[PDB]
């Protein structure tokens, strides 16, 4: 519902905030565009850590 909210306005872990910024992600929609395996490939993390970001932004923007 709030796909255009900035990722920096959420209390994501410091480590994943750094990874999102360094790989060029800006908004909720930039993350929620992707499945866990797609997001983990881009951020160079494992699938479960990608799932975690996705599920948290899904509940927070709804
Ligand atoms: Zn895209």
Author numbering: -1 to 60
The authors write:
RAD51C is an enigmatic predisposition gene for breast, ovarian, and prostate cancer. RAD51C is a central member of the RAD51 paralog family of proteins that share sequence homology to RAD51, the recombinase during homology-directed DNA double-strand break repair (HDR), and with incompletely understood functions in this pathway downstream of the classical cancer susceptibility genes BRCA1/26. RAD51C binds XRCC3 (CX3) to form a heterodimer, and separately with RAD51B to combine with the RAD51D-XRCC2 dimer into a hetero-tetramer (BCDX2), whereby all paralogs except RAD51B are considered essential for cellular survival. Yet, recently RAD51C replication functions distinct from HDR functions were described, including replication fork protection, fork restart and fork reversal.
Consistently, crystals of apCX3 with both full-length proteins diffracted to a low resolution and determined preliminary structures lacked electron density for the RAD51C NTD. In addition, we solved high-resolution crystal structures of apRAD51C NTD to 1.6 Å and nucleotide-bound apRAD51C CTD to 2.3 Å. This data is consistent with the apCX3 core complex adopting the same structure as the human complex in solution with the RAD51C NTD flexibly attached, in concordance with our limited proteolysis results. Also, putative Holliday junction resolvase activity within the N-terminal region of RAD51C was proposed, albeit other recombination intermediate resolvases have been identified since.
